Amino acid sequence: SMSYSWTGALVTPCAAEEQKLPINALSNSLLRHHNLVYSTTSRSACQRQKKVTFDRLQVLDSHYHDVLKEVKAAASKVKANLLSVEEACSLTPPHSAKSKFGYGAKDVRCHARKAVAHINSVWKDLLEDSVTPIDTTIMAKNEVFCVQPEKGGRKPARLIVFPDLGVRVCEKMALYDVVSKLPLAVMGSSYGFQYSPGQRVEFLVQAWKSKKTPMGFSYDTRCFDSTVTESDIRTEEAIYQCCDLDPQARVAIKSLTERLYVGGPLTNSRGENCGYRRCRASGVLTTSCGNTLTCYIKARAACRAAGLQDCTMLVCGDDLVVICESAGVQEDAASLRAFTEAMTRYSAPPGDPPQPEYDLELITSCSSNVSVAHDGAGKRVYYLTRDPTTPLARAAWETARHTPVNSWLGNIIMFAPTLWARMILMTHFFSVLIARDQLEQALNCEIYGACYSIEPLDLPPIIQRLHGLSAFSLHSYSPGEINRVAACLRKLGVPPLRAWRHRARSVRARLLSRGGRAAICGKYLFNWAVRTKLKLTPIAAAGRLDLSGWFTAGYSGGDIYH
Ligand SMILES: Nc1nc2c(ncn2[C@@H]2O[C@H](COP(=O)(O)OP(=O)(O)OP(=O)(O)O)[C@@H](O)[C@H]2O)c(=O)[nH]1
Ligand SMILES: Nc1nc2c(ncn2[C@@H]2O[C@H](COP(=O)(O)OP(=O)(O)OP(=O)(O)O)[C@@H](O)[C@H]2O)c(=O)[nH]1
Ligand SMILES: Nc1nc2c(ncn2[C@@H]2O[C@H](COP(=O)(O)OP(=O)(O)OP(=O)(O)O)[C@@H](O)[C@H]2O)c(=O)[nH]1
Ligand SMILES: [Mg+2]
Ligand SMILES: [Mg+2]
Ligand SMILES: [Mg+2]
Secondary structure: OEOEEEOOOOOOOOOOOOOEOOOOHHHHHHOOOHHHEEEOOHHHHHHHHHHHOOEOOOOOOHHHHHHHHHHHHHHOOOEOOOOOHHHHHHOOOOOOOOOOOOOOHHHHHOOOHHHHHHHHHHHHHHHHOOOOOOOEEEEEOOOEEEOEHHHOEOOOOOEEEEOOHHHHHHHHHHHHHHHHHHHHHHHHHHEHHHOOHHHHHHHHHHHHHOOOOEEEEEEOEOOHHHHOOHHHHHHHHHHHOOOEOOHHHHHHHHHHHHHHHOOEEEEOOOOOEEEEEOOOOOOOOOHHHHHHHHHHHHHHHHHHHHOOEEEEEEEEOOEEEEEEEOOOHHHHHHHHHHHHHHHHHOOOOEOOOOOOEOOHHHOOEOOEEEEEEEOOOOOEEEEEEEOOHHHHHHHHHHHHOOOOOOHHHHHHHHHOOOHHHHHHHHHHHHHHHHHOOOOOOOEEEEEOOEEEEEOHHHHHHHHHHHHOHHHHOOEOOOHHHHHHHHHHHHHHOOOOHHHHHHHHHHHHHHHHHHOHHHHHHHHHHOHHHOOOOOOOOOOHHHHHOOOOOOOOOOOOOOOOEO
16 A cells, blocks of 8 residues: 555746845844755655655554544534534635636635635535545745754655645535544543644653653654554544534445545646645645544554553654653663554654653754743743744745744744744844834734734734743753753854844844833843843733633644634
């Protein structure tokens, strides 16, 4: 059972693709080593195709079946509703790919007659035909990275596979409520997307503290989407059907499963037949929920096979971290080998073998880790951080070029307490918004795969709400964290922190002079930058922010706008 079969046709671009970071005075002011920053393009798709194409051998055992029974039992408690066409239309992002049937995202969002007509016809066809494969488009993702020579140079483009806009709206109708509710019901505290960054830290720290001698590891499945089998996808359908659903939803979900999720033909942007998929599509509404469920089932069963004691797992799509009670160094190492062997039997071998870790800060989940800093009183404060290389590289690109959805604002929100987000990202972007007179302009950004419209001037109350008041006064960061930041700045040609402090003092002064929300930004975000610090009291407007639904479910690949 090959994940893909290919015809030899190329994955083709739909527009001009830039490979190299453009030179721009403002981007260069953030980082000068522009030759290290690149975007993936369709040019490397062949290399990706090779990597993602393989045979899946899958052997399920008693542990697998025991866990599946638990999951189905949990699912039976869920009630999920159909969304109306109108409701689903409104979840469509302004930048979603247009339909081949004569309408686009804007038409969907304004409920235009042509769009709604077609959507209704697609729905009727899902109800009447449960068999005919639905077409999909395959594209190469254009995503920005920094080169890492020691690690093979440049990453090939990821491939995304997605159906027509009409179909995407129907997926929302049938499954939006299901994918928004089911993971949590099934795996409880193990579902990672229910947590804001601070809540994720709280979960990991308590798990770590709860063990007599904790041991943790991350498990990296090689090409997770390709490892997902037809039977895995049909099992996901069986799980969805355990919920209390509307009768039409049951039919639609079965049709979507057999016609779209389980596999189908791949067409490139030029209309050429590229091949056929028999694994997870990366650009459907169920990508995140499906990957999370399937990862959880296999991992939980594999923990049992591995004889791991008192396991706590955190699962976000294909990203898995496990914290358990150590049985000793040799014992733990052997258990991880057994865990890997089990995961391999279930179709999910690792890229690189997992390694047992015995320090909390060294455990990396969704490219992030827990670290410790201190508040003004010397109290330890735990917070979520990560290596700043990718965030800075993308921030540079987004300064040089207008992008539909900007990673930098999401990164500031997620990583607000970090030394690097505070001193570099905040200083940089407020200076940019000041230069361009864009302080008042709302921006699109992503949080767990869903697109939000956020006003940069609302950052302080947002940060207080998610991270607490201490986010604006952390100091005495860890040696490992300081060193990681320092190494990154050297690599990328980013000015040193003391230079950013000077720049921040100027940014702060300009914001203060504007009064209102701008002044609150200057006061709270940049208190670290002045000699005589202000007293920061709770921000009034904080409680009035509607953060409903932020950090509650994963929607990567799902074409969701909130
Ligand atoms: N994690 C989790 N497990 C659950 C949940 N609900 C039920 N289970 C477990 O799932 C297992 C299978 O469920 P059932 O087959 O319905 O349990 P049963 O009806 O008593 O039948 P047996 O378990 O086979 O004896 C049970 O052992 C439960 O402990 C849940 O909400 N979350
Ligand atoms: N499964 C999946 N993950 C994606 C996709 N796009 C971005 N990602 C992210 O990529 C991560 C997986 O990266 P890796 O474990 O490094 O594997 P990889 O994507 O093949 O990249 P390499 O390490 O170069 O092999 C996931 O955890 C996601 O956070 C996607 O379309 N599907
Ligand atoms: N289509 C699709 N996109 C995904 C999936 N998982 C993650 N993504 C998106 O891929 C983009 C890049 O993923 P990131 O979370 O930044 O991970 P990354 O590109 O490997 O970069 P690092 O985490 O820093 O290593 C983000 O916008 C994610 O929302 C997926 O399963 N399908
Ligand atoms: Mg992986
Ligand atoms: Mg230790
Ligand atoms: Mg990554």
